[PDB]
Amino acid sequence: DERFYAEHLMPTLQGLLDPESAHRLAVRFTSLGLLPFQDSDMLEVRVLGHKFRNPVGIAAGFDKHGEAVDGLYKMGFGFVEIGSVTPKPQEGNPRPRVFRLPEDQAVINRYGFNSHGLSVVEHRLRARQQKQAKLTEDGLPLGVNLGKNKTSVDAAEDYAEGVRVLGPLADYLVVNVSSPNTAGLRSLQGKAELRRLLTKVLQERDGLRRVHRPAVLVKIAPDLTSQDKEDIASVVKELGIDGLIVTNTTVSRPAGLQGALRSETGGLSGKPLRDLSTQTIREMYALTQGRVPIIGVGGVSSGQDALEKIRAGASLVQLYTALTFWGPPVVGKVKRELEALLKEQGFGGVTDAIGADHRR
Numbered sequence: 001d002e003r004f005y006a007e008h009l010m011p012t013l014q015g016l017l018d019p020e021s022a023h024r025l026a027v028r029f030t031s032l033g034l035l036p037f038q039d040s041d042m043l044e045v046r047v048l049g050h051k052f053r054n055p056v057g058i059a060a061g062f063d064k065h066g067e068a069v070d071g072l073y074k075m076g077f078g079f080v081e082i083g084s085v086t087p088k089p090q091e092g093n094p095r096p097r098v099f100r101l102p103e104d105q106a107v108i109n110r111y112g113f114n115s116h117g118l119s120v121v122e123h124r125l126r127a128r129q130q131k132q133a134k135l136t137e138d139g140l141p142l143g144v145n146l147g148k149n150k151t152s153v154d155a156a157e158d159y160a161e162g163v164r165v166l167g168p169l170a171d172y173l174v175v176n177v178s179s180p181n182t183a184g185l186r187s188l189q190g191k192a193e194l195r196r197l198l199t200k201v202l203q204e205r206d207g208l209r210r211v212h213r214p215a216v217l218v219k220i221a222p223d224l225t226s227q228d229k230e231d232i233a234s235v236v237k238e239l240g241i242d243g244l245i246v247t248n249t250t251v252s253r254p255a256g257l258q259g260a261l262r263s264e265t266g267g268l269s270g271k272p273l274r275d276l277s278t279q280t281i282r283e284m285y286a287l288t289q290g291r292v293p294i295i296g297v298g299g300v301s302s303g304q305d306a307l308e309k310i311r312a313g314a315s316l317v318q319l320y321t322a323l324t325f326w327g328p329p330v331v332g333k334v335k336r337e338l339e340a341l342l343k344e345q346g347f348g349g350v351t352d353a354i355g356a357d358h359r360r
């Protein structure tokens, strides 16, 4: 129940544990299915070669190693993304590396891709691969988000290894070139780098057998220049990339942040990123002429937040940070409010609202 979690459970949990410990305990509880809304057809969306029974997903970073997929579907998410996963295991940055900004409903993290590695996650997904095939057919798809190791010398070979190893187990894969916490990674977003990296990714993906061939998406940052966005849009059309994830966390620090920890290094998420993300979705949708599916992510904690990103051009949305403040009831809250607003605004379902701001 919303108020109980919002007002009692979550604050108490937050007073008791540092945020990294709270996150680990939350993954454990979720993966055991220790948690307590029926989805309307208005919320169903068809995109990326799949049906999604509702358009609200959990963003990458919550379940980094694939341990809690089924408990996430049970929380009400229409789709789950895990990762980012790197080819070899690696520890990530020294602690502390995650900071709560409760007066801003924000988080700053600099995990640095702590990952159990491809092999461990491959085994975990294979142990439930046929159960995921049926979830997917029932409208509950799985994405896998790929990163690169810290000491790797050849970024494109790290991503290609992830497509070869986890591509056969995913409905879509994400080439995450926008973490702000791995040195040099964001420079993969530049025109020449990106084109060469994505050509190699797509060749690897196309060499998979047909029933194991995922869609491929690129996840980008909220901090790009106008020139960067134009170059991304052009590469994405030139290569037939299947969609974009918009956006990762920001390295900016918007005026007015009150949290005592606002000057920690790392990516900032939650409310202060919300409109910078929505504006990036609006611009990428226009530059791609509405023809490249976008998954909208950054500061979503309500139905109105989801629908804004929807009308700016997103076909699906994701959240993470709002879960850390509101807990599990936020998921049904976002869905029930989104459905009430679609009705109030005269849309037949999510699908008719996608990109609607661009048609006024």
Ligand SMILES: Cc1cc2nc3c(=O)[nH]c(=O)nc-3n(C[C@H](O)[C@H](O)[C@H](O)COP(=O)(O)O)c2cc1C
Pocket (backbone or CB within 6 Å): 059, 060, 061, 062, 064, 083, 084, 098, 107, 109, 111, 113, 145, 176, 219, 247, 248, 249, 269, 270, 271, 273, 297, 298, 299, 300, 318, 319, 320, 321, 322
């Ligand atoms: C604690 C933390 C860890 C994250 N780790 C990843 C990650 O490994 N891969 C990734 O693509 N995005 C990662 N993200 C970014 C989220 O997927 C999402 O893009 C961002 O947090 C904005 O959404 P939100 O405001 O709803 O949290 C992480 C975010 C947070 C808060």
Ligand SMILES: N#C/C(C(=O)Nc1ccc(-c2ccccc2)cc1)=C(/O)C1CC1
Pocket (backbone or CB within 6 Å): 018, 019, 020, 022, 023, 026, 029, 030, 034, 035, 098, 100, 107, 323, 324, 325, 327, 328
């Ligand atoms: N701080 C913090 C939290 C956090 O509190 N996460 C969280 C998410 C879901 C729950 C929850 C509560 C009840 C059942 C299942 C999950 C609890 C904590 C995070 O997930 C990220 C690293 C900062």
Ligand SMILES: O=C(O)c1cc(=O)[nH]c(=O)[nH]1
Pocket (backbone or CB within 6 Å): 061, 084, 109, 110, 111, 112, 113, 114, 176, 178, 179, 180, 181, 248, 249, 267
């Ligand atoms: O591992 C992390 O540091 C991480 C990766 C990512 O893509 N985004 C982020 O905010 N943190």
